[PDB]
């Protein structure tokens, strides 16, 4: 069908408009001032911004991770992706040594496959760049269309890989044309630290901070960004989130190397001394790398500005307090590490960002959709308001305040660690290939409406 | 009437799609694939793109300078803009101490009156910042719409001002919303130079590079960042030639404050070599700051490629070589300085960027258009296709082999600083509000039909 | 006289060990552990250090400054030198535009003319670098001994120079092999803040530190850095107060430019909250740059302790509380500027940075005494304990835990900054060239008794 | 016996005088211009300097290395250093893992028992951090006089330690008061870059330094820096070769972290084209980190000039040219890595360095003695010229011009990477604790002479 979308105003990563939107199918057919469509449905936006869709590059659900598995799956998840104003996310496939990359994906598409109400891509952890590993990637890359690789550099004995995994997997990458991302923290640092902690007696969340001190996260950073250097290839530092990891980022973008960098609502918005709440409070909390002093959230802000960052992801990774963090009781390093992110970071990066005049408009729509698509390959289908395009647009009414709450989320998890905090900005419809997902706040759409979308090799924006 | 560009390519800063334009008027009124537009003229856009018009924020055109005036004026230097795929000019109105600011402005509106063939905004000299000259700008930015002011911290006893000029017009400018922009090299550092050159007999326009070492221009920049750190203000750097500059703007935008950069075709793709050229042809390339060591322009490719410099104007500043430049045979300080470089910025920053992946094409479309108009109070209504913009347009040819040539260029000057270059790229045809000015190229258009352009207080992109 | 001072502990800038020194008249003419030398006086330093005497390259005598003269003249000035272990001063002689030098240099002769107590060099004050300037300069180099020249960036009115004189200087100065020291902090930018402060009603002490944020002295510090590299010359930053004039610095001396700072105690031990007593109690503490942050005192200690600042100086500038500094009652502008800090500096160098680990025994002399001797032309003769060297020999006793106070000091001033400071570490006795001005905290010396120091060429140390 | 030795001008890392030198036993016991002495043998030492005698502290002899044993013993190698102006060495004993600290330790005691001419101490290897050797660590540092610990980041498969072994070094180190060492390259790149060029069939000399970027050695340059940082410890970096390693040391030196740096005079004065003579003569200047472009040679000068790296040491680590060399004939990475450099470290510091203004004779002695010897625990006993230290002299002649020759030197190899090199400074007589080991020019000393040296806890100098 067409669904004819009047009176609202267009914003997207260069252009503020107002102007009416056609859609025909799943596509944006045509934009104007005076279309009369004929045989349309009409959607009146009066009084919203009409966005693209966000994108979120960094999820994990259904995850196996902490001892447990993450409690959104990807029913759940996209749907709350979804009443959040994400119309796409891109989640970790994780793999294990000796396993062939190809089993996991199949794995990955069996999590998703008829549950996800909103597209998804995936990208594929790399444990360790064996020939026969590397071999695989040829395939991942060119037919499976996973075009970007994910390295563990803490997690030790879980998930971490050594700095040859890494630098194998750099060439190999650049080859494929495949952009590598970084978990940037030191593992044997981290996993040092931890261990002092526990001999001391030192159990409570708050030491989960403490043992993965912001100079850690740094000299990953800057690890990752010589051997990208080294290699001639591309890299993408997830959640970065202090001014020691800004820095370095700079420094490598100053030198003309292709270094990119994601941070996250939590990181923006939230500070180390949230993990010292009582009554194993803090455990909502826990979640790597940990919360910083508070002022490093201004120079994450002001890298936003100044293009030294260039994307918000969630790393929705969701365990309730009730059972799941409670693994963690009387020793933190047991607490399953993520927080319940996906639904909000759209309302926060506005409400935060753009209405406290950190960010402009159209960065926030640059920063939560349009260059993550083209970061991870899936631009222009996504990430842009413009014929030709999926048409995955958001309608939101940027007058509304509330607060936000475990009581009105959709994530299925029994917290939320922005539980009270007051936003302007209210998702009201949510379109996905053209079919509403979310209509006036009601869900619409459908387990399995959602797609898989095969990603494009890695091109500069 | 209305004009229906059909089968085309739309490159914007975000967008890249195929799809019909539909102007009617002066404004771009519907864009899609199937717009089936009654009474339109058909323009065949077959195997083009169609981009956003160029917007050069750097002109000097009919200016008193070097001891004569520019060639080129309102009229030839716009028809020459427009050759060259750009549709509006943001040109320097100068000033002299002890005249109003309102006199100076008048003098400008007279010299493009009746004369410009394309848009046009200006922005205004401060020389000193006088009580009557700070309470004079209020009119200036809120009712003449000039909302950038320029000072020289070069050119002693000619256009240079001091510190204490530069701040209060900073504090001033932060009071009012208005964009500073420097020239920036250390005015007396140069003068002592030019002085010791000339005692010892160094008379050649190589020594035009050698009295003005890339130290000065870093020190004139760095003294202008913390300046506008101290006053909270915004600056834009004009024509960065070198690593000195890119790097400290680089730190200042680390540090959040708002410091944003322009480079020049000229420090892209020419010289220091250039000015050694005998028989006087050395001195076709004096400008300042002066060209550079060759290694300095991948330095500035890596900042337009990261985001550390956000926009390319031309300093098109034009001087014959015969009679004109030849002012200063015997002695370097009486060449007049300045290039003609308006035309060939459009297809060098495509051919020399684009084509050798030093930017990618939405880039290119930012950095010669739409944060120019961001920058510059232009935008919406220029710097992009979008419906409710200005119809200003180019049809440009990415495939058409041709070599640069004061035998074929528009300028009205006696030769080009590019002259033997090879590149892709040709502008066929340009409109500007929706009438043709080039017109597969030839020109259409007319003296008088360019508009001022009244420009918004400033807004962070 | 021979004396042969015995049982002590000699340390240099090098060396620490237990040993015997003879003086025969005055010089050191041997150092030994069984010298058995006859027809000598027996000096017992028994659980003392013998130091070289303190070197205080920063001084302001009986200076003509604030719209009053300083309170300490060369005698009372140079007796409180040497109560706090310092043995020569080298002081600034000030000039005035179309003063000849060698009058200026003339009259700061006549104040120190059988007045001094210890040894005395001048710096000279460069106000203009006209050419008869700098032809005079060739005598006060070669002539009258002054290897350093003074150059005041800030006092706009009052002693402030521009760039044009500064980079003059500096090319001069290499020419005739002297060191350029600089007051760096950008006059301009001061001057509209202290009006501004004033217009706002901003009169209180604490507005004198607002009205010079550290970022002024940044950007001078940085400027005077590249006009330096600029003319391939020498450079010294008196008063390095803050992190960001370090910054500067560091990266300097690590491209290798002969860029040299100096700090001062009141930067290391106090801190801008001194500026808020109330009732006047803050004009105490107005002198500049002012007390910064107390952050700002880690970062010049770690500077000292790794060898990016390289030497200590007092500002010794000192004004009465009554009368003098009450001229700036309802006006911080009209305080004069000025802290009394000649009588404290050893010791507070070696109570808080010596006994607290932040800097060497050996650094605390090398930073006091031998390499202020080297940068000012003024080694061998002093800055060391050694075979040859004049017998300049301070016995301190680094066990003696007392107060600091105006009741106890010997500074013709009527408070003292660091009253109710505790401190170990007392000066018991002091020798000049090889006879006692103070013996055991006794005043022995006379008026007059200190010597004129003609100073050496500039060598690298 | 008594010497008493005459006419000579005394050089410290702080002084420059004319006296006499009387030592009495292994010790210096007076110094004096008219001393008088009796029943003392005269020196006469008229026109040379004394220099405390050169503290080598990164010598390979008699090492197990690259599939063959370096070609100096204890012998020949310390009677190399001796002709040199060396007195001291500080030997690498090597570990493996699973061996006892202690057995190694008996191990390098062995090679040097009744064959060191002069006095050596030894660092230790740890290859593992095993809970066992962290408790051995204690005697290791409190009962052997080991207070130095060598972690190699490179030599993957032979040396190599991870990141966990380095940082749990750290932290045991600053309990114990130990300075850590690192070989900073990353082993990991490195194995992949040196196996990639082989398949490659790149078998020349010159894969060695291609295989081994600067940037490898800058990653683990910083990242040995960050873990230091997290442990609060003190790092010394041996061999820096390159700019991005300095800018690292630099770095962390102003945030006051207690990192210091070494260079070597192969760094210096040797660039990465030695390695491109054919015939296999590249094979002669094999060693790592490799020989690097020349432009990074002023760059080491100047830090050593600024204060940013602190000594020179030699990497002693000679393989003759034919047999051991030839093993990597058709295999780079089968050439033992090694220079022939103990002898001619002090003359060309001297020579390239003092004689060319790169830095001072004072900073001469502190760079090749006196730092060494306060960095590694051996002062005042070794290191300087001063009342009760032990008479470890050398007579240096600075006027001889000579060249360095295989011919001429007494290194145990077939021949010497200076070759040719035209030199000022000749070592003329050597004293080993009062005793002489080179008088004139030959040797006089004995196998057996030296001693081993019980080395302090570190503290800063
Ligand atoms: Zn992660
Ligand atoms: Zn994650
Ligand atoms: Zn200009
Ligand atoms: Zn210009
Ligand atoms: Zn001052
Ligand atoms: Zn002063
Ligand atoms: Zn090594
Ligand atoms: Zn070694």
């Known amino acids: 069908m067409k669904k004819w979308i009047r009176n609202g105003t267009v914003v997207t990563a260069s252009d503020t408009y107002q102007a009416d939107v056609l859609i025909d199918g799943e596509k944006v057919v045509a934009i104007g001032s005076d279309l009369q469509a004929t045989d349309a449905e009409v959607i009146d936006a009066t009084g919203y ?132 991302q970084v978990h940037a923290e030191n593992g044997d640092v981290l996993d040092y630290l931890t261990k002092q902690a526990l001999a001391e007696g030192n159990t409570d969340p708050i030491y989960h901070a403490y043992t993965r ?16 250097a080294l290699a001639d290839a591309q890299l993408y530092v997830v959640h970065v989130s202090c001014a020691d990891a800004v820095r370095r980022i700079a420094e490598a ?99 935060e960002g753009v209405r406290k005049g950190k960010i402009s408009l159209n960065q926030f729509v640059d920063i939560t959709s349009t260059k993550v698509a083209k970061l991870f390959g899936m631009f222009p289908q996504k990430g842009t308001i413009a014929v030709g395009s999926d048409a995955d647009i958001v309608l939101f009414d940027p007058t509304v305040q509330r607060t936000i709450s475990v009581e009105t989320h959709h994530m299925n998890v029994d917290y939320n660690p922005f539980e009270g905090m007051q936003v302007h900005g209210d998702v009201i419809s949510v379109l996905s290939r053209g079919a509403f997902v979310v209509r006036n706040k009601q869900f619409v759409g459908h387990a399995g409406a959602g797609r898989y979308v095969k990603r494009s090799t890695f091109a500069r924006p």
Not at 113 to 123: L, S, T
Not at 213 to 228: D, F, K, N, Q, S
Not at 294 to 315: E, F, Y
Request: some cysteine; hydrophobic content about 40%; proline content about 5%.
């Open 253 to 351: 973008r100053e030198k003309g190397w292709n270094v990119y960098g994601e941070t996250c609502p939590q990181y923006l918005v939230l500070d180390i001394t949230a993990l010292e709440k009582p009554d194993f409070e803090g455990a909502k909390y826990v979640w790597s790398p940990p919360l910083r002093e508070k002022w490093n959230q201004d120079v994450l802000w002001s890298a936003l500005k100044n293009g030294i960052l260039q994307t918000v992801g969630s790393d929705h990774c969701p365990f309730n307090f009730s059972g799941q963090k409670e693994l963690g009781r009387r020793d933190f390093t047991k607490i399953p590490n993520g927080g319940p992110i996906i639904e909000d970071r759209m309302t926060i990066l506005f409400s």
């Open 213 to 228: 001190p912001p100079e850690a996260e740094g000299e990953a950073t800057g690890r990752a960004i010589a051997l990208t």
């Open 49 to 180: 911004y009409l966005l693209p869709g966000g994108i979120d590059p960094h999820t994990h659900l259904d995850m196996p991770f902490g001892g447990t598995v993450t409690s959104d799956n990807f029913f759940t998840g996209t749907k709350a992706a979804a009443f959040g104003g994400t119309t796409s996310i891109v989640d970790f496939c994780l793999t294990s040594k000796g396993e062939s990359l190809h089993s996991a994906i199949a794995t990955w598409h069996e999590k998703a496959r008829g549950k996800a109400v909103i597209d998804y891509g995936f990208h594929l952890m790399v444990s360790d760049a064996n020939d026969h590993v590397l071999e695989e990637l040829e395939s991942v890359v060119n037919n499976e269309g996973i075009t970007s690789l994910k390295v563990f550099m803490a997690y030790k004995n879980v998930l971490m890989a050594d700095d040859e995994t890494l630098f194998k997997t750099l060439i190999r990458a650049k080859e494929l044309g495949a952009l590598v």
